[PDB]
Symmetry: D2
Subunit: 392 residues, 4 copies
Amino acid sequence: MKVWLVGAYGIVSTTAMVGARAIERGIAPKIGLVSELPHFEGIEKYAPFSFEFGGHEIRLLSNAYEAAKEHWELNRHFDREILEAVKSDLEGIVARKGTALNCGSGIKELGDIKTLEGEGLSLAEMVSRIEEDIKSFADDETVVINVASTEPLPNYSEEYHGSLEGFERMIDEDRKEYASASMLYAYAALKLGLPYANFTPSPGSAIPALKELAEKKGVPHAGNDGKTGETLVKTTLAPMFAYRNMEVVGWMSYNILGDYDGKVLSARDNKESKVLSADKVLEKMLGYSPYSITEIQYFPSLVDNKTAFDFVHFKGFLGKLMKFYFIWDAIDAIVAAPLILDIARFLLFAKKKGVKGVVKEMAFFFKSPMDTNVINTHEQFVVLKEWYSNLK
Amino acid sequence: MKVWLVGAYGIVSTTAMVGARAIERGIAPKIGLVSELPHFEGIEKYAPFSFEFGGHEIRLLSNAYEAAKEHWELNRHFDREILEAVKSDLEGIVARKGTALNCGSGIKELGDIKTLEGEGLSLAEMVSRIEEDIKSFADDETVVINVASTEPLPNYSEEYHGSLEGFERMIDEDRKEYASASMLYAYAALKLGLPYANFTPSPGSAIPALKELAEKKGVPHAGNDGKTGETLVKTTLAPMFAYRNMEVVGWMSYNILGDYDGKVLSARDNKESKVLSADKVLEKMLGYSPYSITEIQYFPSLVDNKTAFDFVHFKGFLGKLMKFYFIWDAIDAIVAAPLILDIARFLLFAKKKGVKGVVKEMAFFFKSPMDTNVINTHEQFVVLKEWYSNLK
Amino acid sequence: MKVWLVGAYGIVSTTAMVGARAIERGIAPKIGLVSELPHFEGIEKYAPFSFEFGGHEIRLLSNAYEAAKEHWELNRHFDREILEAVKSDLEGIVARKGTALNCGSGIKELGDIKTLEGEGLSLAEMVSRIEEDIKSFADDETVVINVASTEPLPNYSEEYHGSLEGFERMIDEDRKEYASASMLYAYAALKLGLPYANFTPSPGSAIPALKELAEKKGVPHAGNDGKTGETLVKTTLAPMFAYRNMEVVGWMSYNILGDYDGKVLSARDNKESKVLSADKVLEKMLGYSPYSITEIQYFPSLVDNKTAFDFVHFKGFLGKLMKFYFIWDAIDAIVAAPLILDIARFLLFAKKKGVKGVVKEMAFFFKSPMDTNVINTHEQFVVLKEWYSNLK
Amino acid sequence: MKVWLVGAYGIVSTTAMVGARAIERGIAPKIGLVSELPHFEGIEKYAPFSFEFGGHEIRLLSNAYEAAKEHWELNRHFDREILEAVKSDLEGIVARKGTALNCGSGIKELGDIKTLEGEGLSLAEMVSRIEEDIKSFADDETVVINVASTEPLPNYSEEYHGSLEGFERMIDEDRKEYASASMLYAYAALKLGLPYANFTPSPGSAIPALKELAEKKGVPHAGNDGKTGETLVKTTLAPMFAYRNMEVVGWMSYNILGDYDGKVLSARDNKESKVLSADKVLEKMLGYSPYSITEIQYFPSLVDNKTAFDFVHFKGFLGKLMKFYFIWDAIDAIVAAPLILDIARFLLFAKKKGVKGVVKEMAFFFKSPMDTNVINTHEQFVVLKEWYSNLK
Ligand SMILES: NC(=O)c1ccc[n+]([C@@H]2O[C@H](COP(=O)([O-])OP(=O)(O)OC[C@H]3O[C@@H](n4cnc5c(N)ncnc54)[C@H](O)[C@@H]3O)[C@@H](O)[C@H]2O)c1
Ligand SMILES: NC(=O)c1ccc[n+]([C@@H]2O[C@H](COP(=O)([O-])OP(=O)(O)OC[C@H]3O[C@@H](n4cnc5c(N)ncnc54)[C@H](O)[C@@H]3O)[C@@H](O)[C@H]2O)c1
Ligand SMILES: NC(=O)c1ccc[n+]([C@@H]2O[C@H](COP(=O)([O-])OP(=O)(O)OC[C@H]3O[C@@H](n4cnc5c(N)ncnc54)[C@H](O)[C@@H]3O)[C@@H](O)[C@H]2O)c1
Ligand SMILES: NC(=O)c1ccc[n+]([C@@H]2O[C@H](COP(=O)([O-])OP(=O)(O)OC[C@H]3O[C@@H](n4cnc5c(N)ncnc54)[C@H](O)[C@@H]3O)[C@@H](O)[C@H]2O)c1
Ligand code: NA
Ligand code: NA
């Protein structure tokens, strides 16, 4: 299959790519890959473990190996022997210039960039560029996945976001103020008939205009926001207090990371997307609102080794308060990369089984799952096993 | 309803008793009580929230208030106002002398004791004493719950444990070597037709002889070993790594507590019951065996504020290792006491709905659930909701 | 001795007062009191353990017992038996209306207040009120200690802060914009010849104008900002990495607390004082600057049980990075209250031994110690033992 | 200078050796090296940073590179580029067969071994072998350092350990029962006039017989037991509670590690040396005894990444209890290796300045410092700076 990755030179994207090749060549195991769990035995009928890559970027690099090597040099998150072994393959992956339209002050932190809007292009002329890039690449086993830096909350609009005719009136009118890059790549993927998933908390396809598009076109789509680390523990651990009839009175989450993702999210406007996609979640599981703080702070020595500290204060019998603490030390790109591969495969599956519109049943992968109030990791894994069973 | 509690002067038992009265008088909330969750709306038809208490003890105290006050003085785990309010009621709860038969070197740590075997009695004469105590107390809404100190592994016997005729040949023969106190109270409860649960990891009713008894007599029973704190997190958190196709390569659990339970478990022979009821659990959820250490150490300053430190080391994508830590700070008797009340109510329910034999469906409450390989807290809560739905 | 406490109805102040009486009546031990360590044997010649209290407040309460009881009700940070025992004594402690001048947006969080400036008074007329309150109270064994909510950074001024003639030209001119409440109480204490310490990070006496005053008047003074919890660990633990020739590359401190102090510091302008009095400290011990973040977030369930989470990332041999974590769970008022008593006693001592100006040698008590680059807790404890030895 | 290392193929030893060469070739920094702190400017007059290595081993390997590579393969605790760069130099380091005499059941865990006693040799004939190995190597700038696996407590003897004439009567008599390998290498180093340090908690030179020897021969010696990680925090952090007049009521230390050191210490008899060299330390700083547990458990996934979890429970004002937690994640060989280099250099220094007998002033490096009750890391660093100042 083919996968077009927006943000193709990022750490998640490049580590998905390193990983795919390394497993393909049989020099790495298949751990971390949900689509390789036994209950999904049979998936390789529809989405075999075979990948070719392309994508959009705004940072300047020769190819995807150079990009992979840049993150590796800092993180050493896979062996030098893997890098060497996948070099050749990754050198032939060359991203295309995308659009950083309304992608926040955070984008400054990425250094050297070049974008389509900086060429002067109108919305319609950018859309055309994006679609040309993908369609030239795409086939009938192609999926577009967004793994680009998180954008701030978009400029509000019922007219331009509320319907597909309204969204297309935006492009027609060249009303840049209401378009964000991630809306345009999602728009482009769906107009071309390709499945789309958003691994970031940027709006993407989560606006009505694009939900309506995906359905008309009969195209499956999923998101938003990969649930990979702290929030996975949170949606796995919060249920417990509910099952035991306890009140969570406060829950603190503090995350520190560096590298590009930590840099970008170091901006106030970009940060806001991720902190509000991480605060309403307790309520969806407990039905009420504990005092819940969630913070991201930049901390450069850690690079992609995002580390989180949470503290859960909770009432139990007689209303006596008690305490729980945890700490997560993992590299974000390792928890994230095989999920891109699973999501893709599950997308191809769903496309082949005639699925269209939000694949709500893929909530298991995401912090802000579209078109569903099922947040509890256990309930989401069941919904996912049962979804796939019904369609196999 | 009535509840006969073995170890009636313990902290769990006395805090169940304080709590029951305090809620009865409407001066405490119903938090921590699973039987009060909305899905169990309707239970109060069969097991209303109304309790009268009795039990067996070996430590010497005037009544259950004096006992409650002793633990309170050290722990202050509920308000002074509650204690005062429940005093009168608890002063009229007077335990009966039980049996510490083959209950380990740990029993020394409890100080002043007196037991039936120390009167010289044979097995048959002790059995008679125990049954006389309970039957005089019991009615048709009576349940017997074991909350006594944890016993070591019992002396092995196919003949005497393997069948009810064989177990009764033990009593007949006065073969003390093969009987443990907790087998005799379980034997007595079931011979009298009362439901029984074991909140401790001592054998209790978990031997074939007594499983066969409960069935013949048409009596429901549940256990073993209340899952209240660290192990609840463990069976709630371990699934996550499985759902995400990760390998847990090692898992460390270290617990420190004091007070009587920490004292008794400070012995090598008594400790062994609890550490082996806490080590095989990962396998039942993951299907393989991480390196898993589980320790209990005495630490007197903590009293009943058992605190646990766990560390989970796990492989993910490409086999990169990563780390998770947690720490649990809670008072054991607060996490444990409403469960005694739930278990009782669920026992009365099950009795009334004609249930007999192991109530496997109550696995949710226990670390060593009898007659079931369902350990995952999520799966156990579902099995419990569905059990009760089918019978309501 | 007498102690006038600014913020006399706060938790620190009231718990110093509860504690002093409880020890006086011999119903509490002398733990937490540095002035009671054996190397300070002999201090009771100059500052016996005997206290009478007064102070300034802006929150409305009948007396210091009602105030003590308010914090106790929420925190239960000492026994009910102590409260009862010290009631009478504390009921006869009645604060006087002070001034909240330029004390930040945070002051809103304290609810019901009344202040001198709200009566309309000029600077000179407020100064007069403050001095009248204290002088009526004071004797020759009186010390004034500031334990009031933290103020934001004051409005900058060389003219009005730079000299005593300049500061007094401020009062004369009624230039409120450049005066903060804590400058006026410090000004008043020193004009009356009383020793002063600042337990908060508000400017207090730490401006040149007031340093010059204290010297002229021959009056000892100390500050700023009680080092009681996290920062005590930080100045005790940071040296270690230096002694071992390691580079600290990043150090994260995150604090969560509630109650009034957490409320007030919940404001952006008030928070700023405490976060900049907690960030430059590493450099003073290591001589360079690790990436250091320090945050305070409001978290109401904790009340005065401020809890902190720090993470220290550091290079060692060959430049390999390694990790250290800690967590502090303590009630702030317990760590803070005996220090008020020590500081006072050490102030009276110093006054009697003819000491004047900044008592740099009391750095051991403070996060921002005036007139000294000695931050390392070990070095500060030595400087303090040696100071007192030289004067005894 | 030359350094003879007992246990020359261990991770500490080989990483000291990798490190020394890598710094020598100017491809690594001098971090972690206490002898390179500015207060020891001038040391390179007496002990320049220049090293040649030799040592005794019992595990079978071709040279010190193969040994270094074995630990590296598992731990990757320095770059591949360093290994390659130091290869040649390390290939020419070939250990000599030593003695595992009375070195515990733990020694089984090391796999393939060969030892002098297994050749049949008497004590006198082994001593001769050991001395021949070292003397052939030694010069006038040679030091012998013990970095071999920890031995159990030795078989008790006043006669044979109590005096040098008595110890030599042991060798003479061939009374193996009372000799441990580490006593014989220490005996040999000192008879040859070489300085000796013990980086392990095995007796070494810490018996009177060998203390008397070192003095007669005018030879400096130091130990025991490198204080590198958890215990360094403990002797840095414990003072704080004392300075603040608090009572530590309990202190828990739990360590988990793997690799050879964790394997060997996995034995009950070997473990005992390290747990009793880690329990009496609090008293030497606080003057009383908190409840203190200290444990080591094997945990193979961690290899040399020893991780520790401590919990400190302590009374403060009014006797209110409060809590502190910490966790140490570091690789033991990184914290340990430059100390071998410092200790050596400080040994050569001391030898040249005519120092003889225990160098008590090197306590700073060790968990069980000989001939001194100075345990507090701050006080030990001062004693060390002042020692060196007095002699420079
Ligand atoms: N565990 C995780 O790594 C995790 C979890 C949840 C969500 N995410 C989201 O995944 C995304 C990528 O994560 P990462 O850690 O690889 O970050 P990264 O910054 O290294 O990668 C993002 C890449 O996208 C590029 N980019 C930014 N805006 C773009 C645009 N509008 N068009 C085309 N390219 C653009 C950047 O140049 C960069 O190369 C981030 O939004 C992150 O928040 C990551
Ligand atoms: N969260 C929890 O508190 C928790 C969790 C799981 C299991 N448990 C089990 O619950 C039991 C009670 O816990 P606790 O903390 O109240 O301990 P506890 O020691 O205070 O109470 C046990 C009581 O039983 C009595 N006893 C001991 N052996 C007896 C015998 N054979 N016959 C009659 N009485 C006997 C003791 O005297 C004591 O009063 C222990 O086995 C414990 O391991 C507790
Ligand atoms: N461990 C600690 O508790 C700790 C450590 C370092 C510094 N401090 C500082 O101590 C101070 C008091 O701490 P707390 O926890 O008791 O807080 P608190 O809010 O309960 O007490 C402060 C009291 O001062 C009063 N106040 C505020 N501004 C005033 C003004 N300008 N004039 C007169 N009264 C005023 C408030 O009404 C309140 O009653 C805070 O600044 C705090 O930041 C506390
Ligand atoms: N931070 C630390 O690494 C640390 C801290 C304090 C003490 N120590 C002590 O340092 C010693 C070495 O630590 P390591 O982690 O390198 O362990 P390691 O097991 O890898 O190295 C010890 C080496 O000594 C050899 N050996 C064992 N007994 C011997 C004998 N009697 N004669 C000659 N060789 C022998 C072993 O074969 C091995 O190669 C251990 O005692 C350890 O407890 C280490
Ligand atoms: Na870690
Ligand atoms: Na705690």
